[PDB]
Design a protein around this ligand. Structure first.
Ligand SMILES: CN1CCCN(Cc2ccc3ncccc3c2)CC1
Ligand SMILES: CN1CCCN(Cc2ccc3ncccc3c2)CC1
Lengths: 349, 352
């Protein structure tokens, strides 16, 4: 349960924005509980009295999201219209009402289950074929990294620990290294598509009641960082996410495990599912040509995986200065940068 | 024939938002033409050279829309949804200064085409369809009297200089609009009308006659320009449309419209409209008792004609507000008086 200053707001929003029973519902009939609290993007679960029959096809239970601009909204509406996302039941200046999808999030170690990562591949490829009314020019990747790098070189921390950690990070010569990375990635062909850009296990729902479905038990959510971007980044980033488990209950509240990065075999298995789903003609290609393509895609995504480390490393340093959320951001930054340089050595680039 | 800045900015938007031949298009080979000028919602046609080949789906031609001089999230979300549902033009690009839309070969309707039976029948079907839609917006019917209240307040505190505008304003105030509003409200709050997703501005200039289709009998029109849309009393949407039968905005001299009260649809014409509307809006209707059909229709007419009074009042108030702030060449005050003339005349018609 929430505070008084809300739940009423939540009451009004549900009563005004939802059809059916919601329309005549009394403030004492309103059921609401917290799904995730905090200062920003708070989730809530609102529901009709179980003793209330629905008048039409309106939802019994809904997700309320409180922001705590225009593109984010257009995108969610579109994904909703195409059944790629939760339905959009209502939208307003300080949040929105979304479909409540009975489910849990994936856990890190589940990303490696052959059936799971085969469906994530298939879903990412599908996400990747969608037309969106947004800029098709791949500005996002280096634009965001420059934006973050510049912030980082302006960040001053008070406590000695953060100063120390920032100092060790700045000692990699991030500006120079960004240019080394630009060189590498420019010379690495990767089709521009609509990328989720944050395809981590916490954004993948296992839909309850089909945990037994072999190719249809997952849904991708949270598209807040989505944009047109190099394909290799969405895949590389997701592969990186195999190494990071955010459920750790002690500070810094994540574990990094480099050994958990997908093996070549595991990589070939993800992309062997991705490709058929991304170009429908791929399956009919010559056994030999498929491997030509797969070997190339492996080079492609493992290289862009470096951008995942670099971008989210920088991102993490900024979050440290400004976020309230309890999470060891600097240590995570240090982890992403270690994995960065470990991956460079591994690739010999 | 746009200005250097725009067309340069339009070239860029097109090249960066549109797929296919567009993305490799050079500036020297970019075609743009004006469809509407002004300061607010300029319209442009953009296209590929005729010698250039499309690579895939991409359109050969598109409409650029510049917003000119944050409810934009609502408009944009709406515009995008109607597109996904094939009810509006496709949405190719959205950005701070405007949007890229599908170009749809067509012309708009003339006022006197609104009364043509097939036209009127299809408009009624399209509107009913439009009304059945779920939209992620607030379902409380506050738009109508909220907006009028908003305009009335603005109206009460505007002072003109220019003599003729000053006189015209006072004659409108003569009527005691705050009292008159209150009692429009009482009249209407006693007039049941289903709350639905309304277009709210269904005038001829917002209805496309689709090219290639002037032969189809029930499928040659598309409603567009949903800028004023919202959940609202169905009666408003229909009443407002009926009012627009009376108003012709193609008139070339000041005040740049003709009002003709006597072009308002006859009862026979109104019945012909909702005879298409009702089977298009609800399922069983077609096969209800020919006795209950008539009960439904007759009440609806009282409903839509009563709400037509809100059309006159709302747009009259809006028009007065436009006279202060708008620069567009249009006799807003004269148009304000005409709506209010129709308001009191319609009131007289109804004995309310
Ligand atoms: C921007 N997204 C991709 C970058 C990695 N990820 C790190 C992360 C994951 C889970 C967290 N859970 C709680 C707090 C911080 C967290 C940070 C942040 C999410
Ligand atoms: C809000 N809409 C319905 C109210 C009447 N209408 C007045 C109008 C119609 C056409 C015009 N065409 C050009 C200039 C002004 C115009 C004003 C405005 C549009």
């Amino acid at each position: 349960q929430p505070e008084p200053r809300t739940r009423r707001r939540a009451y009004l929003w549900c009563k005004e924005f939802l059809p059916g029973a919601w329309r005549g519902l009394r403030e004492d009939e309103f059921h609401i509980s917290v799904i995730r609290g905090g200062l920003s993007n708070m989730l809530f679960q609102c529901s009709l009295p179980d003793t209330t029959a629905t008048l039409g096809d309106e939802p019994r239970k809904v997700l309320l999201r409180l922001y705590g601009m225009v593109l984010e909204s257009v995108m969610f509406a579109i994904l909703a219209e195409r059944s790629l996302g939760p339905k959009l039941y209502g939208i307003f200046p300080q949040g929105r009402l979304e479909q409540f999808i009975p489910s849990r999030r994936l856990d890190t170690e589940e990303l490696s289950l052959p059936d799971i990562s085969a469906e994530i591949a298939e879903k990412m490829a599908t996400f990747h074929g969608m037309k969106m009314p947004f800029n098709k020019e791949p500005k996002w990747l280096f634009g965001t990294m420059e934006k973050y790098l510049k912030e980082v070189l302006r960040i001053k921390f008070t406590e000695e620990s953060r100063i120390k950690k920032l100092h060790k990070l700045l000692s990699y010569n991030l500006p120079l290294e960004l240019e080394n990375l630009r060189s590498l990635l420019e010379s690495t062909p990767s089709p521009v598509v609509f990328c989720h850009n944050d395809c981590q296990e916490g954004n993948i729902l296992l839909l309850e009641g089909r945990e037994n479905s072999e190719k249809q038990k997952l849904m991708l959510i949270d598209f807040e960082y989505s944009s047109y971007n190099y394909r290799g980044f969405d895949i590389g980033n997701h592969f990186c996410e195999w190494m990071y488990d955010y459920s750790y209950e002690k500070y810094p509240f994540f574990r990094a495990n480099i050994r958990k990065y997908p093996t070549k075999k595991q990589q070939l298995h993800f992309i062997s599912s991705y490709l058929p789903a991304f170009q429908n003609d791929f399956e009919n290609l010559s056994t030999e040509e498929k491997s030509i393509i797969k070997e190339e895609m492996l080079l492609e995504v493992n290289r862009f995986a470096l951008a995942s480390h670099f971008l989210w490393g920088l991102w993490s340093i900024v979050q440290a200065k400004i976020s309230s959320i309890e999470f060891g951001y600097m240590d995570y930054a240090q982890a992403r940068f270690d994995a960065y340089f470990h991956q460079k050595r591994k690739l010999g680039v």
